[PDB]
Every structure is written in C-alpha cells, then in structure tokens.
Amino acid sequence: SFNFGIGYGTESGVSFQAGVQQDNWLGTGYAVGINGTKNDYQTYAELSVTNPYFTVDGVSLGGRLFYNDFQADDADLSDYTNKSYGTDVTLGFPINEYNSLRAGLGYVHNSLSNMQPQVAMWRYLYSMGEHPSTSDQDNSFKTDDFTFNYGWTYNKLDRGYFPTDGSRVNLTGKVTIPGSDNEYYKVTLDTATYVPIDDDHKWVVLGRTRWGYGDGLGGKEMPFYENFYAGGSSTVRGFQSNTIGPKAVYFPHQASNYDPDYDYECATQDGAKDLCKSDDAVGGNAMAVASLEFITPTPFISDKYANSVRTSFFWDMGTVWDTNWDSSQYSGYPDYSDPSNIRMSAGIALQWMSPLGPLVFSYAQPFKKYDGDKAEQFQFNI
C-alpha cells in the first residue's frame, strides 16, 4: 500500500507521515507493513512482518518492531519526555474454522524524563520503589518489560464485509514473565453480536461491548502506559478520543520550561499551594463499554449501490476507572475508583466504505456526562 505527507503548521509539527504495505496474493509468502510519523513532538515508526504459512497446517507467525519517541518541546528537552521501543513475536493457530488462538512474547523499553507530578502516576512510582519529589520536574524512570501475550478469537458471522448475523469475540491478554521490571497482568475482551431482524437482513440489531481489566502483581501497580482510555469513534462516540475516565490531579510544583505568557496547571510560579483538579485524562486500569446499534436501511439511497453503505441509530455507554485510587486520602476530590460513573451518548451513524476501507461518519451528543469530559459531537474515522 501507499501514503505520504509532510507539513508546515497544523497544530502538530513537521508531520512526515507514511502508511505502506508490501504484500502478495500467493507465492513468496511475506506480508510487510510500515507506519511512520515525524512531528516536532513525536517520532513514531512501526515495522511489521507476517508469514501466513509458517507450516503446512496453515499456522501463521507474525512479528513487529517499533520505536516511539515523544518530546513535549524540542529545542530544550528538559520537559516531559516519553521514549519507548520494543518488539513482539507471535504464533497463530487455527483449529476450528470459526476459531483461532494466539501465543507470543513481547519486550518493551520505556524511558521517562521530567514528568509532571500528579497523584496516580506517582502512586505507581511509589509502588515501584521510586520516590521522586512532587515539588519539581526533576525526575526520571527507565524500565525493561517482558511479557507473554495470548489470545482467542471466534469469528462465526456469516459474511465479513458487512455482517448480518452471528458474533465476533476477541479475548487478548498479557502476563509479565519473570525478569521484567514491571509486573502486571491485563485482559481485553471485545464482543459483537449481530441479530438479523427481517428475512432479507436489511434491518439488523448489533449489540457490542468492550471489557478491560488489569493490575500489578504482589503490590506493584499496573504501569501507567498500559492504562485503558475510552471515548471516540471506536468506543463511545460523542466524546473526544480517549478523554473518558479519570483525570489528572497535579501536585503544586515548579515547572521546568516556564513562560508566564502561557498556561499551566498547579505551577508553583503561578501561586499554587494545594493540589488542583484538571481536564487532563490519564486513563485507568479498568474499563467497560457497551453499544446498541439499530442498523436500518438508508432513509434515501437506492439499493444496488447500498451494498457499500450502512446506517444506524445507536446509543453507547462507557466507563473507565482506577481500582487503586484512594477515596479516603482525597476526600473532597472525585472518586475515580467508582465504576458507576457511566457516560452515555446517543446518535446516528453512517458506516460508508471508501474503495480502500470502511469509513464511519457519525453524529452523537453525550447526555450522561461528567466534569472534565470533552465533547466531540461530530465524528469520523476509518
């Protein structure tokens, strides 16, 4: 496949961007993919390979190697900086024609510099045996993680382009193998169920849900870079992408790259003494979302070109929470450990299809919403 971009001032930076696939229909076997993105504030590069006929049985072997370097400034560094890289290798086993299992190993390196002091991150750091200040941005951290990844996928829906009956279930999980700096476990389960409502399967009802849980082992916290985020086209639309859930509360501190002409949160050179609540989403260790979509015929399009279009009336529900948030130590501050802060939105959606992939347009308005949540009533994604 094919893409490219650069830029000059979009809010983001230089904006070198690329999505590429080198592939085959038959023969030589390799399936190669490449993603790239360079900004003033990020350098992301992902290289992926897969052999779909690792052996006669049809079993597949897939690996990938990634680099992801984020700098909140450029020229100074000395501000919040998050570099990551790593590798994955996995085996995929078909058994039943409906099913597949997956098992593999992964390694991830994470380097942090000058992270802004906030409660949740620093609860985790304290749990790891690290005690940074909470009064300044002079801190750092560095971890090597090794994980065993597994999964099971069930895909008995009668047709795959535009489903009409049956279910797709996907369970994927991680457990740290001994030797890693972080020690955690994680599970994520996607479920989708299509029930046809007329004999021609032009009206359908889709139920859908995402579940996610995870935690640290033996007294460690789950690494913050593995948190769950909700909101957007993929989960609960009507909200800004990944903004649902716990928000950061910051400790009063001296910011490292300060400028009084700009805006800061609990900066000590703005007069901050107490900790203060913010809009900044930080995700959690637990997540549950659901969605009911009534798929209907298009209210004014003709039927033979409609095989590329789908229309639905939906409502989405969703919540993200942090199990280890201390509801007692921060009495006047909202309980981010409560699961019942369920956001809810409803709207209309149009699952179109570009010649190279399905596209979801949608409008929604969130009606069950909480403070700090950012609304995004008009949504588009691939």
């Binding site: 504030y41 992801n68 909140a72 900044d280 930080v282």
Partner: peptide, 15 residues
C-alpha cells in the same frame, strides 16, 4: 497524552 504548553494543547502519542 503529553501536554505541550507552547500550543496550549494535549498531544496523543500512546497509540
């Protein structure tokens, strides 16, 4: 999210 101040904006980089 990574907060960059000189554009008053929160930048998504975890995905």
């Amino acid at each position: 999210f990574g907060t960059i101040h000189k554009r008053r904006f929160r930048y998504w980089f975890c995905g």
